[PDB]
Amino acid sequence: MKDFTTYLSTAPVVGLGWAIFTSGLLIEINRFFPDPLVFSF
Amino acid sequence: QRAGNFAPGSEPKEYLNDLPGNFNFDPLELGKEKGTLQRYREAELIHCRWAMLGAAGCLAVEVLGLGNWYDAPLWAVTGDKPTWFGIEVPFDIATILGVEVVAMAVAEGLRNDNQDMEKRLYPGGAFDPLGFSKDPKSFEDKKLKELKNGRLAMVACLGFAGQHAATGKPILAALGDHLSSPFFNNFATNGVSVP
Amino acid sequence: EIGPKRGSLVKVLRPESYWYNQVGKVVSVDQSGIRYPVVVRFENQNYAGVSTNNYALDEIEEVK
Amino acid sequence: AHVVKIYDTCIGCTQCVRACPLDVLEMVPWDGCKAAQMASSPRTEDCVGCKRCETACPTDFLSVRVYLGNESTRSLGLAY
Amino acid sequence: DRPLWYPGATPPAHLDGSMLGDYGFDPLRLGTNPDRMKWFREAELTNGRWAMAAVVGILFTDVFTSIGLVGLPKWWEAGAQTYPIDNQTLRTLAIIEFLLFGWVETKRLYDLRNPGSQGDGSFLGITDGLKGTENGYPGGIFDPLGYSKTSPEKLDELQNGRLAMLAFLGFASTAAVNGQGPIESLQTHLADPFHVTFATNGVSIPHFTEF
Amino acid sequence: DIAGLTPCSESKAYNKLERKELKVLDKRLKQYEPGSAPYLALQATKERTENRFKTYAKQGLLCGNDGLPHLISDPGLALRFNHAGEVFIPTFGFLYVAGYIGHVGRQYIILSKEDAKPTDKEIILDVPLALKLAFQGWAWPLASIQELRNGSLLEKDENITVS
Ligand SMILES: CC(/C=C/C=C(C)/C=C/[C@@]12O[C@]1(C)C[C@@H](O)CC2(C)C)=C\C=C\C=C(C)\C=C\C=C(C)\C=C\[C@@]12O[C@]1(C)C[C@@H](O)CC2(C)C
Ligand SMILES: CC(/C=C/C=C(C)/C=C/[C@@]12O[C@]1(C)C[C@@H](O)CC2(C)C)=C\C=C\C=C(C)\C=C\C=C(C)\C=C\[C@@]12O[C@]1(C)C[C@@H](O)CC2(C)C
Ligand SMILES: CC1=C[C@H](O)CC(C)(C)[C@H]1/C=C/C(C)=C/C=C/C(C)=C/C=C/C=C(C)/C=C/C=C(C)/C=C/C1=C(C)C[C@H](O)CC1(C)C
Ligand SMILES: N[C@@H](CCC(=O)N[C@@H](CS)C(=O)NCC(=O)O)C(=O)O
Ligand code: SF4
Ligand code: SF4
């Protein structure tokens, strides 16, 4: 468990956890909010 | 000697201690070198004197009703001879410029060769034939007086050209406009001053 | 007795040295007498991968 | 040929000689700490300029630098 | 130090020192450097003091409007009613505002820089009264109500200023999505407290309450 | 009217392009029954395409002789008009996010220079420290300017140069 949590600080973590968070966030923003190309005002 | 601070409580600048008209101004910390400050004070005094003359003339033209300071040389394009109180001086366009160039050349060249660092600023002898500078205490006071009154004339003359550029009206006309309705006739209501 | 105290960190001023203006502890200032007495030790590698070097005493200077 | 130099920056590690493939440089008296040797280039007719002696020299900066010069049969490694 | 913002187990680092309205709230550690803390203190003071005199114009003036005594307009269009007025000092207002402020804001600026530093013959004969006891707490201004020993009433001022800054933020956030004024929103919310709520206006999710 | 461009509602080419797209969609939309999945997919696609074309034409965005939208990037032309969102506020939003990122990364890489073998921390990150700094950088403009006045970001010329 300890060595596993230590292993979870490398490429297989943020760099995966990161950029997975970001791809998901961007895809969800483009899905709920379909086609933005200019701000509200 | 020091006449005041531009901002009360501002930290003094050691460059300007023994200078006339000291207000602790220089904020960009120019003239810090001991050599440039002399030239810069020649600039002050000479610009102040030229300004004061120009402002006096611009005001006098309109006060006595002869016309506009902006329309002064403008006759050169129509061709009508120039006038000083309608005396109708007869000289042409090229003669004026030539005599100006030669006279300014002679006078400025004589002025430049003084090499008396204190007289390059405050000449003596023939330039004050009345002898107002003989009294040491009154001389400093009149120095401060001309410095202040020329610092006004320098700002006024820039206000002359700035006013005319946004609104073509003359000096006294714009002053009367403002004194008529102060809150309406302003520089933000020009439409050109502030975008 | 010649060079800086051992264990005291010092910087480098060898103009041609990978380690320049940055600090490094001294291994042992050579007391036997030689032109490059101060042996400084650095943790970060160089282009060659070496960690230590010996310098002259007219080149090293004080701490930051 | 290849002008080889050896500066005073040296510790006498005896490594740039057990690494040179052409046995070009020697190590004769130097007043050091533990080994007390300094490198020298007595002969250059056989030096090819491979810069293998500059890779093993741990001195910072390097103690030996090969000033590239003109080529010959030895300097071009030509068996023909 | 007065009670903490989190009641339990949240240690402050540099807020153990005495200061007005200190509840140990600084999660982002923006006031670690003492000089910047000394600046942000005056920042709070000028913001709070300004928002209180503003929310009163929105609160105490609209309470009479709802009751029907006065017919003043709401603040989200009180600015538009002015210049259409017959006697309207048109928008030479903003620039004269800036001039008249600047002249005083610079005095306060240089006083914070050199505390209590007002030349002797700098301002006509009133140089004397312009010296401030402390930063952001000048003397010559409050006529009465400062010569007590219990000077730590500044807690009331700071708490009311924070409450009024929240008040104006809520005013701007309401009059932007609720469409009505603060008093009107309050009265509709007392009328029916379950339907008029930020959940129905401001968040995008619950708008899909399709059974 | 700026740059000879016209608001994008009065563009005959823009409406012609919308009609072209809708015809191209419907020609292969008519291949499936109204109950199947592909039909619903094409229906939703047409929905958000019509939504594209409707929602753009609000607050004003100029389309040229080609009918396509053209972003105005000059501050001043986005002012005196209604174009401040074309690219003026997105600039500040990206600046905010990029600040945020650089601030957090710098404070991380600085706070790691003190412990033994910092290189390890660059291949085995301090996840809780990174999470803490990630939720503390959204005031970075305040911290940056005053950390600049502070001087804790200027290195006093103690780095490796060659000249
Ligand atoms: C005000 C001015 C310049 C102002 C500059 C200033 C204050 C600089 C200030 C600072 O440097 C300090 C001090 C310290 C630094 O750290 C900071 C800054 C801020 C940089 C110039 C005026 C300059 C004024 C001048 C030269 C006036 C001359 C008038 C002339 C020539 C008029 C001619 C005629 O009007 C007549 C007389 C008759 C008409 O009929 C015909 C014509 C020809 C139009
Ligand atoms: C809310 C606010 C600021 C909020 C600050 C927050 C949340 C900060 C919180 C934290 O930083 C701390 C503390 C500690 C950090 O470690 C963490 C965070 C979390 C970062 C400012 C209000 C600021 C409030 C101000 C300045 C109010 C001024 C209002 C004015 C001028 C209104 C004027 C008029 O409304 C009238 C009166 C009448 C109308 O008709 C016309 C107009 C013109 C609209
Ligand atoms: C200094 C001095 C000195 C001298 O000598 C004496 C004298 C004169 C006394 C002085 C002065 C004084 C003064 C001016 C005072 C004032 C204060 C204020 C204004 C406050 C307010 C203050 C204010 C405040 C708190 C406010 C608050 C508010 C709030 C919370 C609000 C809330 C709300 C909201 C959100 C929204 C909704 O829709 C509505 C409501 C529900 C309502
Ligand atoms: N009146 C604004 C134009 C933007 C605007 O506010 N339009 C009105 C409709 S003409 C609006 O959107 N009102 C929204 C609301 O009342 O909530 C301006 O001066 O440019
Ligand atoms: S360049 Fe090669 S051959 Fe020449 S001395 Fe160095 S190691 Fe020997
Ligand atoms: S390899 Fe370099 S340091 Fe080692 S003995 Fe040879 S010249 Fe000296």
Ligand SMILES: C[As](C)(=O)[O-]
């Ligand atoms: C405004 As104009 C007549 O000076 O070009």
Ligand SMILES: C[As](C)(=O)[O-]
């Ligand atoms: C008081 As300060 C460091 O913001 O000028």
Ligand SMILES: C[As](C)(=O)[O-]
């Ligand atoms: C978003 As609004 C109430 O200012 O039109």
